[PDB]
Paper text:
During the crystallization efforts that led to the monomeric apo- and peptide-bound [name]-[name].1 crystal structures, seven more structures were determined that all exhibited domain swaps, leading to dimers. The swaps are located at the exact same position in all structures (i.e. Lys-36 in the n-Src loop), clearly visible based on the high-resolution electron density. Dimers are formed by exchange of the C-terminal 25 residues, almost half of the entire [name] domain. The interface thus generated contains a short anti-parallel β-sheet encompassing the [name]ϵ sequence 36KSWW39. Superposition of the [name]-[name].1 structure with the bound [name]ϵ peptide shows that domain swap and tight peptide binding are mutually exclusive. All of the dimers are swapped in the same manner, but with different juxtapositions of the second [name].1 domain with respect to the first. To assess the structural variability of the dimers, 38 individual chains with well-defined electron density throughout were superimposed onto the first half of the molecule. The hinge at Lys-36 provides quite a bit of flexibility that allows the dimer to pack in many different crystal lattices. Indeed, the hinge region varies over ∼6 Å within the superposed ensemble, and the distal loop covers a distance of ∼8 Å in the dimers.
[name] proteins are composed of three N-terminal [name] domains and a single C-terminal SH2 domain (reviewed in Ref. During our studies, it became clear that [name]-[name].1 exhibits conformational diversity and can swap half the number of its residues to form a dimer.
Numbering used by the authors:
A (entry chain C): 4 to 33, 35 to 59
B (entry chain A): 5 to 59
Amino acid sequence: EEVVVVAKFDYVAQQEQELDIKKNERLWLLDSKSWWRVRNSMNKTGFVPSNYVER
Amino acid sequence: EVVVVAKFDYVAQQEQELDIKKNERLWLLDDSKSWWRVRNSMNKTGFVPSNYVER
């Protein structure tokens, strides 16, 4: 259920949940949800789709 | 770091995701930062900022 996308720039993972990629690398993306990293009041962080959440 | 409000429940599907409830207030870790979950050729998956990737 995927499409091959291409990295535009090197990205250096800042946290274990992130992915190191190099410029021009072929990657597989899903269906292509867009995610925000957030933290709740019990101080747990994680990703949620950004269309579930409002400023 | 700004406060955001959950518009709907979200049930985490992976350990990196976060369960939220409708109307829950959360802290958004970096505004102007949307993430895509991608997988590389060695089958490692992780989140990358979406503007580093070209579709």
